[PDB]
Amino acid sequence: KYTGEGFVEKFEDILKGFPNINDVHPFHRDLMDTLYEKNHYKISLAAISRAKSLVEQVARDYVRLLKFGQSLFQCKQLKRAALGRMATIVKKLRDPLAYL
Amino acid sequence: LPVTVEKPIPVVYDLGNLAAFDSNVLDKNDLDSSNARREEKIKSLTRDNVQLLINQLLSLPMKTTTESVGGTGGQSSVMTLLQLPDPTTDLPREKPLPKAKAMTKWEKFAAKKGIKPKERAGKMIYDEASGEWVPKWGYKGANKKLDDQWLVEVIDPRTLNRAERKRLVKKNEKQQRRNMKN
Amino acid sequence: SYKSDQGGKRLPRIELVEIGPRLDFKIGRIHTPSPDMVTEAHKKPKQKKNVELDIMGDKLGRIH
Amino acid sequence: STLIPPPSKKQKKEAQLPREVAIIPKDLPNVSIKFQALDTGDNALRVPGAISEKQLEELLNQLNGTSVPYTFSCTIKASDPYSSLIKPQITLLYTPRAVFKVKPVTRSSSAIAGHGSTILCSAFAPHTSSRMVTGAGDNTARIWDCDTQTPMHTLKGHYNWVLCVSWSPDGEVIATGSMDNTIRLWDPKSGQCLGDALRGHSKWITSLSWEPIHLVKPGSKPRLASSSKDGTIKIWDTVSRVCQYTMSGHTNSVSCVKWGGQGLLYSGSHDRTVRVWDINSQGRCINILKSHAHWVNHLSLSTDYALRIGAFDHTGKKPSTPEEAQKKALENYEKICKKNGNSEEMMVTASDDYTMFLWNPLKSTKPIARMTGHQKLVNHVAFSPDGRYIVSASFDNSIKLWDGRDGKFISTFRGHVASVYQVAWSSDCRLLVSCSKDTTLKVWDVRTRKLSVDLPGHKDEVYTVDWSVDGKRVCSGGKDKMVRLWTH
Amino acid sequence: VQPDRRWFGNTRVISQDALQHFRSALGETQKDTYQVLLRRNKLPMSLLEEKDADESPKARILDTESYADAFGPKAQRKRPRLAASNLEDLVKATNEDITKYEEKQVLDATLGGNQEDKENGWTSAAKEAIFSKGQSKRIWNELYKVIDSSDVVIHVLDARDPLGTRCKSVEEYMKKETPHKHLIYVLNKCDLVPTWVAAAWVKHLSKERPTLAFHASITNSFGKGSLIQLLRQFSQLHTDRKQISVGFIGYPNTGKSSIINTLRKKKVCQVAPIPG
Amino acid sequence: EMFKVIKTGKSRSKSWKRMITKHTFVGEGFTRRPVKMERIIRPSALRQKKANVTHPELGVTVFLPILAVKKNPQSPMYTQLGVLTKGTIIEVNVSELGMVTAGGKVVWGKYAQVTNEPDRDGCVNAVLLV
RNA sequence: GAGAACAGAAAUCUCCAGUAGAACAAAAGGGUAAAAGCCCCCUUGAUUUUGAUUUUCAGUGUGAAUACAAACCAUGAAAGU
Ligand SMILES: Nc1nc2c(ncn2[C@@H]2O[C@H](COP(=O)(O)OP(=O)(O)OP(=O)(O)O)[C@@H](O)[C@H]2O)c(=O)[nH]1
Ligand SMILES: [Mg+2]
Structure with missing residues (x-):
C-alpha cells in the first residue's frame, strides 16, 4: 500500500503541476507549442496518467491477492513481484521524464 | 424450345430419392402393345416429366466451398453441388434396429456405489530404475516384468505368476459368459 | 441438355433419347409380408421446448 | 474442428416443399430504361420487355453502331448491378468490358527447388509467361522456365541479397537490385553479366523502374530509374551504362519510384514527403507534396499496369518494328489514358499514418481524397489494371477496396489472419491475389466481394507473389525456399 | 508428465468458410426481450470482430521526432510542424480562438462563487459521512458475492422514479463478464403511482428487460402469481442444474426484503421503513 | 497443504470445508453454488482467465485467454478442479497468432504448459508446445 | 512326373504341373489368384470436439466416460484403402 501511494502522490504533483496547455489562453496556448510541441507536450503527460492508473491497478491486485498468502516465503515473493512490476513501469517511463 | 409444361394433376416431388410421380389418366389404346405410335407416347410424357423435375432441382440452394489443392473429403471451389432434402418416402428398412443392452453386472455395482468411470488416459506408466516410461502392456509390459527378470528373492515361482494371470484372464472369460446369458 | 433461352441463364430444355433396355413385365402372383414384419421394416432409429439454437x-431460453 | 450449427427439425420440413421455379413468366410489365456511360455520358429513354443483357448489349451496340461489349450496372445507393427487376424509372449504368476472361487459379504446379535461401522478389516477362525471374536471399538471382518448372540460367554475380528486380518492358534487359550497392543488367537468353555493375549508390537498392516504351525513341533502348536507401535517385543509361544524374531531393531513404506518364518521376521517401521530378528539366524537382504524418510506403500510379507491360496485350504477340512498338504502347496507354478524353493519370500515396491520399499532381497540389479506415499500417496499394479500382493492403489482416474516382470506400476483403504483405491483379480486372504473413494465398473476386478460393501449400511465410500478364500462371515466393507456380 | 504425440497437437481448429458464415452472422442476431442465452458456443470471437471502422486512429508521433530531437539542449527542431500556411489565414484562425476563449469565461462564470469564497477566504463544510453509505468495502463484498452466487438476478426499482434507480453500472458487468446470467427488472411499490403511470413505464421498460410490475404485501398484494409463474420457467429451463438461486439487487429501501416476504406469505426477511 | 481448512459453526468446530489456496482456471458459466451445498472453495481473486503466453521460436509473448485445462499433474483430481500449479498443461486461444494448417483451416487452439509458480507471482507464464 | 556328384524313403537345385488335397483367424453354401496365401517396404492409435444414453455435491457452460459424426493420422505416384 505505502509504496503505491508514493508513486501516485508524486505523479499527482506533476499532473496538477503543468498548466495543461489547451484552454489556458490562445496566446499562451500557441506560444508554448512553438517552444514545446503541443503534440509532444500532451502525450507525455497523458502517459503519466496512464502510468499512474496502472500503479493503483497493480497495487489493488497484489493487495487483494495477498490476503490468501499462507507462508512467509509465498508472501515475500509476492512483494518483490509487486514492486518489480511497479519498477518496470517506471523504467519504461524514462524518456518522457527527462523531457519534463 | 419452350420449357414450362403444365399437367392436369400437380405432380408430387420427392427430391430426396430424386423422384417424380405423374398421377394423370393413362389412356389404354395409346399404350397398345401392337401400336406402332407408342414410343412417342412413352417419350413425350417422360421428357415432360423430366423437364419439370430438373426445374425443381435447379430451384435449390447449393454449396460453394473455397478449398483447393488436396481437398481431402470435400468439393473443389469450382464444384457447386445441390443441397438435397431428405428422402420423404419411407422405404422398407433392411435390418431391425440393434439394441443389445444389458447392465453387465458391473454397471449395477457401478450404479450402487457411484464409482465414476476413469479418464482412459494412456498406456504408459512411469518406471523407476530405469527412468523410462515403458508402457503397461502391449510391449515390455509392466505385467510381464516379473517373468523376465533374473532373480526371485524367495518349484518355479515365475510360472505361478503366469498361472495366476491365467486365472484372472479367464475370470474375464468366465464373467464374459454370464452377462452374455442375462 | 439444350440451352433453350426462354429459361434464361438457368433452365435448359431436356430432350431424351432411348437407351433402354426396352422391357415389358407381366405380373404373376405375390407373397406379402406380415403386418408385424412391416412395422419392423419401418422404424426410425430415434437418434426441447422453449429452447432454440441461434x-x-x-x-436460447424463451420465457413466455 | 469447429462446425456450423445444424439445420433444425423445423427447417428440415421446409425444404421438403416443391418450390420456386424462376419462370420469368410472360414477363409483361413494361418500365422505361435510361443508359449512362460511367465516365461522363448519359444516353435514351426506351421501354422493352424484361429481357436478358445480351440483347441489351446488342441494343446498345447498334445505338452507337459499334460493329464493343459492355458491363451493365444499376440501382445506384447500395450498388446492386429481370435480374435487377425483381428488386423493385430505371437508370442503366454501362461500362466497357475489355472482353477477355481470366480463369481463377485453383491448383498449382509442383513446388520448385533452387537457391537455398529466402525469396525476395519475382516478376514475369510481359511477352510470355513461361519466363519469370526471382530475387533470392542468396547472392544470386534465378530465371525459371515456367513450362518445365526448371532452372534456366542460375544467375550469379551479385554478392549480397538481390532485393528488387525488374524486367525491361520490351523484353530485353533484367535489372537486379542488390543489398550491397550494386545493379547488374542481364540478358534472358544468355544469362550473362551485361557489362560492369551499375555502381554509384552508397546504400542498398530500394526500387527499380523502367522508362516506358512509348516515350523512348525508335532505335533506342529504354533507360532505368533507380531508387536507393541513401536517398539518392539515379537515372541510368543501359547503353553506355552510365547514369545521367543523381537527385539530392529527399532527406531520408527513398521508398519507391515510378516513371510517370507525361515524362515525370514520382518518389515516396521516408521524409513523410513525396516529390515530383522532371526528366526534361535535367532531373529537377518541380512539386513537393506534404500531407502524410508518417512516412510513405509504395506509391503507385493509375496507368502503371499499362506502363509495365510495354505494348503487349494479354496474348503477348511480339511487334515487329520499334515504331510499331512506339505505336502499340502509345495505343495501349491511350486506351487507359483518356477515359474522360483527358490525360489525367492519378496517383495514390500510402504510408504508416493509416491513410491514403488521392492525387492529381499535374493538375493541382491538393489531394482529392483522404482514404482512411485501417488499424495497422498500409503496405501495398495498386490500382486496377483498367485504372478504375484502387485496392489497399495493410497489416491489420484486412484488404480494403476503394474507388479510383473519388476515393470512396467499397468493402473489405476480410479473411486474412496475419498481416497482408502484397497484392496483385488479374489482367481482366476481376480477380485479386494477395500474399500475407500467413502461409496461404487468397484470391478475391472484385465483383462479388468474396473469397474465391483459399489456397494453402507453402511451408512458411510468403514474401512475394506475382500474376502473369496473360492471366495464366502465378508465381510465389517466401521464406521456405521453394518456388510454387499456381494456375487454374 | 509423459511425452506424447498430442501436446504438439492441433486442437480447436476452425473450418475456413464458416468464418465468413459467422462474420455474416453477427448482423442478424436480433435480440428478444423474451429470450435468454444459456450456452455460448465457444468461437474465436476476435477473428469474428472488426466491423468496418472508418477513422483509422492517429499515427504515432514519437516515431519520427522522439523527444531529445524535439526539445532540449539537443533539439534538432527548428521550424514547426506542420508550420501553417499563410498570414491572413493565421490572422483569421486565431480570431475565433479569441472569441471561443472568452465565451467560456462568460459561460463558466455562471458555474462559479467558487472564486469569491477564496477571496472571502472561507471554505465550505465537509461531506457528511452518511452520504457515503454505501459504497462500502463489505457492502459491495456482499454484492459480488450474491451476483456470483445467484443464477438469475432480479433488480427491483422504485415505481416513483425508476430512472433514478436504474443504476446501470452492473448490467455493464452483467453483459461483459457473466453472459449467462439474467438480470430482469421488477417494479414494486406500484400502489403509490396513478394507474396509467406504471402502465406507461413497462412499455418503456419491456423493450430491454422483461420488467414485472408488483406490489408487495403479505396480506393484500399484487402481481405475485405472475412472478411465481415467471420463476419456475427458469427452474424449468435449468433442468440439469438440480436447483437455482436468485438474488435481489437494488437501491436500499426498495422492498427487496419486503418482496421475499410476500413471496413466502410470511415474515422471513426483516423489513423497515428506515433504509438500511 | 493447498487447503486451508475452514472451520465453521459459531463454535468454529465443524470444519468440513476446504479452500483451494492456489491459482485456478474456472470455466465461464461458473456461478457459485449454494453455500450449504459447497465443500470446495475457489475464491474469486485466485481466478485467472487470461494467461501471459510466450512462444519458443519467433520471440513473442502474447497475452492470451485460457480455454481449458487438460492435464495437470500431481492429481487426476485437479484436472477436473482446474488447479494451476507449475507444470500444468492448459488449452489456449491462439486466435491472434494465426497458425495455419495444411488445409488452410486456421488453428485457434494449442496446448501450452505453464512455467512459473503462480502462487509466487500473480501472472501465469506459459510456453506453447510447438 | 522327369531331372542334379556327396545324398540314401526324407537335405537343396531345374522343368512339367495341382481350378488348387494354397490356408483359408473362423465353421460353412461358396469364392477370392498379379490373393484375404508367401515375402519385402512404411508407420500409430487409448488423438481432438459437440447434439443423444449416466453420475456429480461447488451441477462443476461440462467433469469424464459412453453413442454418433466431423477434423486428423497411416500408406500409396494415384485411385483409394
Ligand atoms: N407502498 C408500498 N410500500 C412498500 C411496498 N413494499 C415495501 N414497502 C415499503 O418500503 C419499505 C422498505 O421495505 P424493505 O423490505 O425494508 O425495503 P428493502 O430495500 O428491502 O429493505 P433493505 O433491503 O434492508 O434496504 C417498507 O417499510 C415498506 O413500508 C409496497 O409494495 N408498496
Ligand atoms: Mg430497504
Whole structure:
C-alpha cells in the first residue's frame, strides 16, 4: 500500500503541476507549442496518467491477492513481484521524464 | 424450345430419392402393345416429366466451398453441388434396429456405489530404475516384468505368476459368459 | 441438355433419347409380408421446448 | 474442428416443399430504361420487355453502331448491378468490358527447388509467361522456365541479397537490385553479366523502374530509374551504362519510384514527403507534396499496369518494328489514358499514418481524397489494371477496396489472419491475389466481394507473389525456399 | 508428465468458410426481450470482430521526432510542424480562438462563487459521512458475492422514479463478464403511482428487460402469481442444474426484503421503513 | 497443504470445508453454488482467465485467454478442479497468432504448459508446445 | 512326373504341373489368384470436439466416460484403402 501511494502522490504533483496547455489562453496556448510541441507536450503527460492508473491497478491486485498468502516465503515473493512490476513501469517511463 | 409444361394433376416431388410421380389418366389404346405410335407416347410424357423435375432441382440452394489443392473429403471451389432434402418416402428398412443392452453386472455395482468411470488416459506408466516410461502392456509390459527378470528373492515361482494371470484372464472369460446369458 | 433461352441463364430444355433396355413385365402372383414384419421394416432409429439454437450455437431460453 | 450449427427439425420440413421455379413468366410489365456511360455520358429513354443483357448489349451496340461489349450496372445507393427487376424509372449504368476472361487459379504446379535461401522478389516477362525471374536471399538471382518448372540460367554475380528486380518492358534487359550497392543488367537468353555493375549508390537498392516504351525513341533502348536507401535517385543509361544524374531531393531513404506518364518521376521517401521530378528539366524537382504524418510506403500510379507491360496485350504477340512498338504502347496507354478524353493519370500515396491520399499532381497540389479506415499500417496499394479500382493492403489482416474516382470506400476483403504483405491483379480486372504473413494465398473476386478460393501449400511465410500478364500462371515466393507456380 | 504425440497437437481448429458464415452472422442476431442465452458456443470471437471502422486512429508521433530531437539542449527542431500556411489565414484562425476563449469565461462564470469564497477566504463544510453509505468495502463484498452466487438476478426499482434507480453500472458487468446470467427488472411499490403511470413505464421498460410490475404485501398484494409463474420457467429451463438461486439487487429501501416476504406469505426477511 | 481448512459453526468446530489456496482456471458459466451445498472453495481473486503466453521460436509473448485445462499433474483430481500449479498443461486461444494448417483451416487452439509458480507471482507464464 | 556328384524313403537345385488335397483367424453354401496365401517396404492409435444414453455435491457452460459424426493420422505416384 505505502509504496503505491508514493508513486501516485508524486505523479499527482506533476499532473496538477503543468498548466495543461489547451484552454489556458490562445496566446499562451500557441506560444508554448512553438517552444514545446503541443503534440509532444500532451502525450507525455497523458502517459503519466496512464502510468499512474496502472500503479493503483497493480497495487489493488497484489493487495487483494495477498490476503490468501499462507507462508512467509509465498508472501515475500509476492512483494518483490509487486514492486518489480511497479519498477518496470517506471523504467519504461524514462524518456518522457527527462523531457519534463 | 419452350420449357414450362403444365399437367392436369400437380405432380408430387420427392427430391430426396430424386423422384417424380405423374398421377394423370393413362389412356389404354395409346399404350397398345401392337401400336406402332407408342414410343412417342412413352417419350413425350417422360421428357415432360423430366423437364419439370430438373426445374425443381435447379430451384435449390447449393454449396460453394473455397478449398483447393488436396481437398481431402470435400468439393473443389469450382464444384457447386445441390443441397438435397431428405428422402420423404419411407422405404422398407433392411435390418431391425440393434439394441443389445444389458447392465453387465458391473454397471449395477457401478450404479450402487457411484464409482465414476476413469479418464482412459494412456498406456504408459512411469518406471523407476530405469527412468523410462515403458508402457503397461502391449510391449515390455509392466505385467510381464516379473517373468523376465533374473532373480526371485524367495518349484518355479515365475510360472505361478503366469498361472495366476491365467486365472484372472479367464475370470474375464468366465464373467464374459454370464452377462452374455442375462 | 439444350440451352433453350426462354429459361434464361438457368433452365435448359431436356430432350431424351432411348437407351433402354426396352422391357415389358407381366405380373404373376405375390407373397406379402406380415403386418408385424412391416412395422419392423419401418422404424426410425430415434437418434426441447422453449429452447432454440441461434446461428452460432447459442442455446436460447424463451420465457413466455 | 469447429462446425456450423445444424439445420433444425423445423427447417428440415421446409425444404421438403416443391418450390420456386424462376419462370420469368410472360414477363409483361413494361418500365422505361435510361443508359449512362460511367465516365461522363448519359444516353435514351426506351421501354422493352424484361429481357436478358445480351440483347441489351446488342441494343446498345447498334445505338452507337459499334460493329464493343459492355458491363451493365444499376440501382445506384447500395450498388446492386429481370435480374435487377425483381428488386423493385430505371437508370442503366454501362461500362466497357475489355472482353477477355481470366480463369481463377485453383491448383498449382509442383513446388520448385533452387537457391537455398529466402525469396525476395519475382516478376514475369510481359511477352510470355513461361519466363519469370526471382530475387533470392542468396547472392544470386534465378530465371525459371515456367513450362518445365526448371532452372534456366542460375544467375550469379551479385554478392549480397538481390532485393528488387525488374524486367525491361520490351523484353530485353533484367535489372537486379542488390543489398550491397550494386545493379547488374542481364540478358534472358544468355544469362550473362551485361557489362560492369551499375555502381554509384552508397546504400542498398530500394526500387527499380523502367522508362516506358512509348516515350523512348525508335532505335533506342529504354533507360532505368533507380531508387536507393541513401536517398539518392539515379537515372541510368543501359547503353553506355552510365547514369545521367543523381537527385539530392529527399532527406531520408527513398521508398519507391515510378516513371510517370507525361515524362515525370514520382518518389515516396521516408521524409513523410513525396516529390515530383522532371526528366526534361535535367532531373529537377518541380512539386513537393506534404500531407502524410508518417512516412510513405509504395506509391503507385493509375496507368502503371499499362506502363509495365510495354505494348503487349494479354496474348503477348511480339511487334515487329520499334515504331510499331512506339505505336502499340502509345495505343495501349491511350486506351487507359483518356477515359474522360483527358490525360489525367492519378496517383495514390500510402504510408504508416493509416491513410491514403488521392492525387492529381499535374493538375493541382491538393489531394482529392483522404482514404482512411485501417488499424495497422498500409503496405501495398495498386490500382486496377483498367485504372478504375484502387485496392489497399495493410497489416491489420484486412484488404480494403476503394474507388479510383473519388476515393470512396467499397468493402473489405476480410479473411486474412496475419498481416497482408502484397497484392496483385488479374489482367481482366476481376480477380485479386494477395500474399500475407500467413502461409496461404487468397484470391478475391472484385465483383462479388468474396473469397474465391483459399489456397494453402507453402511451408512458411510468403514474401512475394506475382500474376502473369496473360492471366495464366502465378508465381510465389517466401521464406521456405521453394518456388510454387499456381494456375487454374 | 509423459511425452506424447498430442501436446504438439492441433486442437480447436476452425473450418475456413464458416468464418465468413459467422462474420455474416453477427448482423442478424436480433435480440428478444423474451429470450435468454444459456450456452455460448465457444468461437474465436476476435477473428469474428472488426466491423468496418472508418477513422483509422492517429499515427504515432514519437516515431519520427522522439523527444531529445524535439526539445532540449539537443533539439534538432527548428521550424514547426506542420508550420501553417499563410498570414491572413493565421490572422483569421486565431480570431475565433479569441472569441471561443472568452465565451467560456462568460459561460463558466455562471458555474462559479467558487472564486469569491477564496477571496472571502472561507471554505465550505465537509461531506457528511452518511452520504457515503454505501459504497462500502463489505457492502459491495456482499454484492459480488450474491451476483456470483445467484443464477438469475432480479433488480427491483422504485415505481416513483425508476430512472433514478436504474443504476446501470452492473448490467455493464452483467453483459461483459457473466453472459449467462439474467438480470430482469421488477417494479414494486406500484400502489403509490396513478394507474396509467406504471402502465406507461413497462412499455418503456419491456423493450430491454422483461420488467414485472408488483406490489408487495403479505396480506393484500399484487402481481405475485405472475412472478411465481415467471420463476419456475427458469427452474424449468435449468433442468440439469438440480436447483437455482436468485438474488435481489437494488437501491436500499426498495422492498427487496419486503418482496421475499410476500413471496413466502410470511415474515422471513426483516423489513423497515428506515433504509438500511 | 493447498487447503486451508475452514472451520465453521459459531463454535468454529465443524470444519468440513476446504479452500483451494492456489491459482485456478474456472470455466465461464461458473456461478457459485449454494453455500450449504459447497465443500470446495475457489475464491474469486485466485481466478485467472487470461494467461501471459510466450512462444519458443519467433520471440513473442502474447497475452492470451485460457480455454481449458487438460492435464495437470500431481492429481487426476485437479484436472477436473482446474488447479494451476507449475507444470500444468492448459488449452489456449491462439486466435491472434494465426497458425495455419495444411488445409488452410486456421488453428485457434494449442496446448501450452505453464512455467512459473503462480502462487509466487500473480501472472501465469506459459510456453506453447510447438 | 522327369531331372542334379556327396545324398540314401526324407537335405537343396531345374522343368512339367495341382481350378488348387494354397490356408483359408473362423465353421460353412461358396469364392477370392498379379490373393484375404508367401515375402519385402512404411508407420500409430487409448488423438481432438459437440447434439443423444449416466453420475456429480461447488451441477462443476461440462467433469469424464459412453453413442454418433466431423477434423486428423497411416500408406500409396494415384485411385483409394
Ligand atoms: N407502498 C408500498 N410500500 C412498500 C411496498 N413494499 C415495501 N414497502 C415499503 O418500503 C419499505 C422498505 O421495505 P424493505 O423490505 O425494508 O425495503 P428493502 O430495500 O428491502 O429493505 P433493505 O433491503 O434492508 O434496504 C417498507 O417499510 C415498506 O413500508 C409496497 O409494495 N408498496
Ligand atoms: Mg430497504
